[PDB]
Every structure is written in structure tokens, then in C-alpha cells.
Design a protein around this ligand. Structure first.
Ligand SMILES: Cc1ncc(COP(=O)(O)O)c(CN)c1O
Ligand SMILES: *Cc1c(COP(=O)(O)O)cnc(C)c1O
Lengths: 427, 427
């Protein structure tokens, strides 16, 4: 397995950028070895700089649900760019995507496009506070909502993967308004409320965790959170940057049937380009400039190219059988990985909901962040490298959900199982 | 001048999005309240959904320094996308743009790409506090450094445009670690250090402000800042999201010879696409994950489409006599505007440094936000609308700098001045 070119480019990158990467999660610091430098991607595949071909399960961390370089999307962007990529003034396309989104997401009645999930989450951090008049926020341990200062507390994603402490550089003053609780622990939530009466602005959570591994909410947890927040006039905010348009067209809130007050969107909504969004009840959204007092701006927000990409993407997902196919092929995968784990004598747990799955090297079951931390990280490290040499590309971390796409085929699924069998037969 | 389509489109927009826009200033609230919706942009022009054409001086707020829909830039993008628009793993293009930026800007020895100037400013604040270990930052009135918590206090852009005050979802717990002095008040800065000794992480500012209208620093202002911060072992940070690659290839720091410890970039570096970056001294960048404990990530960061547009935009600026052409046409436009105001009996002051200009309806001079505010915004409002009907598109606000591009011709300049004469002969 040669990775000579990747090694050359990565080495160079390290003198130019911190850690040689543009995002901490791309670091192979925990999975052993160095990162693979991509060259191009298409459908369910990705090719590196040394010519090795891989079946992709990272899907650029979420956006590629329709498959990489989807022809219908790239032709729409080819035509689009002829007219300019950014205007700095309104454009009809913003109206089209805005309308599609209201229709798609149950809680969204008014929307505001932004440039990333991190931007969406920061904005909503502010609106949750501006609308309720309270300063404190409850976020769960292991969840991730961008890198805004206040969210850098018990964060999942690369902070988990890399074993980083909370922060550095964010004042105690600001971080003190962040109340944390273990995921799935309703009692812990009620305790924070009745201990800080009239102080909690709201609760923000990933409705289905993807950043501390794949963790589904316990029965009654989401309905319960809906209950305690209505009771104390607090806001229920869903961060659907990762689950939006993936678990279902309307996301987890539509699937599980629980409607929050505000939800943040990202990844899939951009279609491969930088696009984020936050929206919710009209009376809350009314506080955003230029309608209300809360000022939130962005130069490239709502630009034509980005709008074009999300539009075509949503139109593809809207096709019949979309989510039925994803569930079907993803179920075969998760189940298969589990059967092999057992067959080859390995403690493992995991599961899937539509096109998102997870696989842990631990007896489990996994309910929160502390549970996930019990997986065998050394086993995982050896299994990742093994899968990599067999031509399967998985996220370099035990703490990240895995993704499947409409471009993946039964064949691709089967070759992954065949490789998993081979890799796990050793370990 | 019919705006029927722009009218109905914007009317519909108000029902879907807060204010009917993606960024506050696009609503024309300080200039009458009726925006025009763009359909396409090319070279130095813009076209309406009504078929009207304008000579653009907004330039999508900075990005289009090479002219809209530049042929060489979009051809390069059309080629690039056939390889996928987002990888989620390293790519060679990150290396080349990174090397280019390290060579272009003096203070940068290591960079980290992001998706917007806002993300870069969030990151740089956190890194100034983490590197120094202090919590106080000195900002200036009228400077906009991204819609962030700690900084939404006397900010620029919409803030220093439609008089947006302090906070907007940011508590007294966030906007308290940030001190504030008037722009150009070196003595006020000195006081802040002596009055808060051993607890100032650093000073951040726009080296040339464009977010409170165009304002140049006085004689030894920046030089004072470098030294004072040097003596208290505090960091000097230049937010050159707007000035970078426009005032000069290495921005204001190159232009005026003053070197910050860090700088933030944006706008032009993505050439029309959502991109940002922050870099500076190696020893400080070394704290950024994964090379360090400070967390900062981003899903679309360093994506090939963005890197392509950035690389191509920089190649085009490195060509001979770029900034020389910019300075020449802009000085003509600047000097000509002022002359016309003087001959029609209107008080006005302004100026330009390369392809960035300012024009206020007050005799001034303008040295800070307070001065900028003594402008007759009612006259400006009518001025703007006259110009608009004369086929000239200007930033819909007195507190925003204007922009020139490499596609604006001598003739375009002569046509604007003619428009300006017909119009200023009213008011
Ligand atoms: C749940 C969640 N929210 C927010 C973010 C941050 O979004 P982005 O990376 O677009 O900045 C992420 C990114 N992995 C996420 O998964
Ligand atoms: C434009 C600008 C920003 C904001 O960047 P976005 O890309 O809109 O997030 C920050 N600082 C300055 C000085 C700016 O000009």
C-alpha cells in the first residue's frame, strides 16, 4: 500500500499550516499514521494522490449524501457561475431555497442563510439569549456545535478524538454561562433548571448524536426535553447541521416527531459548497437584523452559487425512495459489521438511522459520552488502517458517525463487508 | 427607471427571511428602504431583474477586485469542479494557496483557512487570549470584526451604518473582556493599558477602516500601537479582511511598513467564494489544533473550489501594474467626486488609497466614527437614489467604503462623474 505522495504533501503542509490541516479532524493523530491526501472524488468513491481508490464512508463529513460530484449538481453550478458567484445584493435564488427549507423543516417558519454550521450555531446562541432575556445555556457533554467560545465546553468531535481539554483562550466569564449535562440524562437537566430558576435561556443538542460516536436518544428523552423547556419558558434548539436532510427530509424533528423552537442547518444544505442556516418560529426570528435588534451579517451569505447547489441537492433528496434506499443499504452495512464483529470474536455495538451509522469496539450499549469513551481505541486504530489498506475510507476517529450516500450500491456495501471480514479476522 | 420585479421579489422575501435579506445592509434601510435584486454581474457591471445595468462600486463588498465573473477565474473553477467540490481530507491546493499567502503578507508564516472573515476573527481573538493568557482586548469604535459576541460593541458595517449599539445577543459577560477607544486615539489606548495593567491580551483593528466609511490612520498611529503593545508584551492584530490584497498585495502592513503579530483575511482571498484565513507568527499559530490545545475546526475549510478561486485571484493580482492601475482610476474618481461637490455647493470630504475610497457629506475632516456621524445622511440618501437611477450602483450607506476593480475603465470613471454632476445638481 503506497502513500508516498501523500506523505510528501503532508510533510510540506506541516510547515505551512498548524498540524498540516485546515480542520483538526483530518488529523490521523489518533488512528496511527499520517493522513491520505485526496485527488478527486466521485459517487461513492475517492482517489488519493498515489492512485489508491477508496469507497467513501466519510462523504466529506456529511454534504455528499447525493454522492460526490453529482452530475446534476455540477452542471447546475457550471451554468450558474456564468452569471457571477457573488452579488452583495439580493437574488431570486435566496427566495427559492428559503421557501424549500420552510417546507422541509417543521419548526422553521422564517430562515436566515449563513456560511457554515459554526456561524448558524453562534447566531442561534445569540437569538436564544436575545429572545428569552436569560444568559445561561444547557449543552450536553460530548456534543459539538461549532467553535464559538461558549460551546467549547465538554465538546465532542475533534476535541474528543484528540483528547483536548475544554477551550484555551475563552474567558471563564463567558464559559461560566454554559451548563452541561450527560447526554440522555433527563434528571440532570431538570436539576439544572430548578437550581437556576429564570436563568436558562434554552437547551441545545444534537437530536441524534454524531460527534461522540453515533448515539440515538433514549425513549422519552426528546419529548421530555420538549416538556421541561415549555414549562420554564426556555427554548428547545435542535442542532441539525449533521442530521438535517439525512435522517429524513425534515431531519430528526420530523422523523421522531418532536418540534423545537429553533434549528440550525449546515452540510447537506450547501450541497458541497459553504452554506449554513438557522430558522424557527417567526416571532423569534423577527429579532434578527434588519427586522429586529440582533445584528448578524455576512458578506457571502445567500450568494448565487451556494443557493444553486443546495437547491439542486434538496430537489434530488425530494425524489421518491430517497430515504428508503439509504436505510436499506445502511442497515445491511451496520448489521453486517456487527455480525462479523461477533463472528470474529469482537465486542462491538452500533446501529443506524437512515444514512448515518456508528460502530464501537465496546460491549456497550452506548447512551452518552462516557459510554463511548470505553471503546478500544487501539483496536479501532488497527482496524482503521486495515480497512484503509483494503480500500475502504472511514473517519479517522472512534468519535464520528459514518455516512452512506445514494451513490453507494449494494456492491459497494458487500465489498466493505468482505474487507471488514478480512480485517477483523486479524486485529 | 422601473423596479417592478425587484419590488415584488423583495416583497415576497420579507415573508421568508428576517428583513427579506441575508445580510442587514442589503435592505437599503438607511437609504430609503427599496433594494434592487441582482440577476447577473460581469466585469464592472451589474444587471437587474428588470434589465437595468449599473456600473458597480460595491464589488460584492470587496471580493471582485479583478472584476465580476472573471473569465480566467471561472474557467479554472469549471475545470476544478469536475473533481468534486469538497473532499473532507487534505488536497495539494491547500498547500499552494497557503504558500502564496505566506509569501504575500509580511506577518504570516503559517495560515489556517476558514470559511469567512467572521470565523477568522473568532479564532484570532481566542488565539490572542490563549497565547498571552489574558482576557482583555482593545477594540476601536467603528471597526467591524465579524458578527461575534465579544466584539458586537460599537462595531462597524451595519453597526456603524444604521447605528446598531452594543450586544445583540452578547451579554455583559462577553462584552466586558473587550475595552474600546476611539479610532486614532493613541493616548486613549495608552490609558487603557496603564489603567488595566498586566491584563490586556492585545489590540485588534482595521489598519484602514472601511466599515465606518473610509478612514485612514493618522501620521504615527499604527506605529504607536506596535510599540505600546510591544512594551506590555501584548499582541497587535490587523483585521485585513477588507484591506488585504486591495490596499496592496501585502495589504496595509506592507503599504505602511507596520507588522502585526497576526492578521485575518477574507473577501478577496476566496475570489467570490466563501473563504477566510488567519495567520501570523509561527510560535503563536503552533497553539492551533491539531498542532495545539486551542480548538478551531470547519467542515468546508480548505475545499478545492475555494482554493482554486483564491489561487487564481492572486495570480491575477501579481501581474504588472495592478495596484498602480487601481490607484490611478480611483484617485480620478475620488478627486472628481469632491470637485463636483465643491462646485455645486455641497460640503464633502473623502479620499482613496488604491482601489478603496470614501466620500462623506460633511467638510470634516473625518478621523473617527464621531466625525463620520456628522454627515448629512438625508442628502446622502437622495444622492444615492439619484445615482442609482443614473445607472450607478453605490453602497447603500454613508458608513461603507466604495470599491474599484481592475475591470473599471477610464470611461466608466468619466460616466460616473457625469452622473454625479447631474445628481449633485439637486439636493
Ligand atoms: C452538529 C454540528 N454542528 C455544527 C457543526 C459545525 O459546522 P461546520 O463545520 O459547518 O462549521 C458541526 C460540524 N461537524 C456539527 O456536526
Ligand atoms: C468583511 C469584514 C469582516 C467580516 O467577514 P465576513 O466574510 O462577512 O464574515 C470582518 N472584518 C472586517 C474588517 C471586514 O471588512
Amino acid at each position: 500500500f503506497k502513500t508516498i505522495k501523500s506523505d510528501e504533501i503532508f510533510a510540506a503542509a506541516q510547515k505551512l499550516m498548524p498540524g498540516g490541516v485546515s480542520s483538526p479532524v483530518r488529523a490521523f493523530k489518533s488512528v496511527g499514521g499520517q493522513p491520505i491526501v485526496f485527488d478527486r472524488v466521485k459517487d461513492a468513491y475517492a482517489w488519493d494522490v498515489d492512485g489508491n481508490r477508496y469507497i467513501d464512508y466519510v462523504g466529506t463529513w456529511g454534504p455528499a449524501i447525493c454522492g460526490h460530484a453529482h452530475p446534476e449538481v455540477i452542471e447546475a453550478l457550471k451554468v450558474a457561475m456564468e452569471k457571477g458567484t457573488s452579488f452583495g445584493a439580493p437574488c431570486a435564488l435566496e427566495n427559492v431555497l428559503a421557501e424549500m427549507v420552510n417546507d422541509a423543516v417543521p419548526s422553521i417558519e422564517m430562515v436566515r442563510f449563513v456560511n457554515s454550521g459554526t456561524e448558524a450555531c453562534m447566531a442561534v446562541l445569540r437569538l436564544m439569549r436575545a429572545y428569552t432575556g436569560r444568559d445561561k445555556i444547557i449543552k450536553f457533554e460530548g456534543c459539538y456545535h461549532g467553535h464559538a467560545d461558549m460551546f467549547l465546553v465538554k465538546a465532542g468531535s475533534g476535541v474528543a478524538t484528540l483528547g483536548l481539554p475544554s477551550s484555551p483562550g475563552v474567558p471563564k466569564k463567558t464559559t461560566a454561562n454554559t451548563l452541561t449535562t450527560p447526554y440522555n440524562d433527563l434528571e440532570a437537566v431538570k436539576a439544572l433548571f430548578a437550581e437556576n430558576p429564570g436563568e436558562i435561556a434554552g437547551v441545545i443538542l444534537e437530536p441524534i448524536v454524531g460527534n461522540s460516536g453515533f448515539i440515538v436518544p433514549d425513549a422519552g428523552f426528546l419529548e421530555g426535553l420538549r416538556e421541561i423547556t415549555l414549562e420554564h419558558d426556555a427554548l428547545l434548539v435542535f442542532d441539525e447541521v449533521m442530521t438535517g436532510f439525512r435522517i429524513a427530509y425534515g431531519g430528526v424533528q420530523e422523523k421522531f416527531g418532536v418540534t423545537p423552537d429553533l434549528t440550525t442547518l449546515g452540510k447537506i444544505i450547501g450541497g458541497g459548497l459553504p452554506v449554513g442556516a438557522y430558522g424557527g418560529k417567526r416571532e423569534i426570528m423577527q429579532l434578527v437584523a434588519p427586522a429586529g435588534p440582533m445584528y448578524q451579517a455576512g458578506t457571502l451569505s445567500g450568494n448565487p452559487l451556494a443557493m444553486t447547489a443546495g437547491i439542486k441537492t434538496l430537489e434530488l433528496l425530494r425524489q421518491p425512495g430517497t430515504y428508503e434506499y439509504l436505510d436499506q443499504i445502511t442497515k445491511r452495512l451496520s448489521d453486517g459489521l456487527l455480525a462479523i464483529a461477533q463472528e470474529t470474536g469482537h465486542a462491538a455495538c452500533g446501529g443506524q438511522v437512515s444514512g448515518m451509522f456508528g460502530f464501537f469496539f465496546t460491549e456497550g450499549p452506548v447512551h452518552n459520552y462516557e459510554d463511548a469513551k470505553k471503546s478500544d481505541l487501539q483496536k479501532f486504530s488497527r482496524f482503521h488502517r486495515g480497512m484503509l489498506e483494503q480500500g475502504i475510507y472511514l473517519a479517522p476517529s472512534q468519535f464520528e458517525a459514518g455516512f452512506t450516500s445514494l451513490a453507494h450500491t449494494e456492491e459497494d456495501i458487500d465489498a466493505t463487508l468482505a474487507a471488514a471480514r478480512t480485517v477483523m479476522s486479524a486485529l
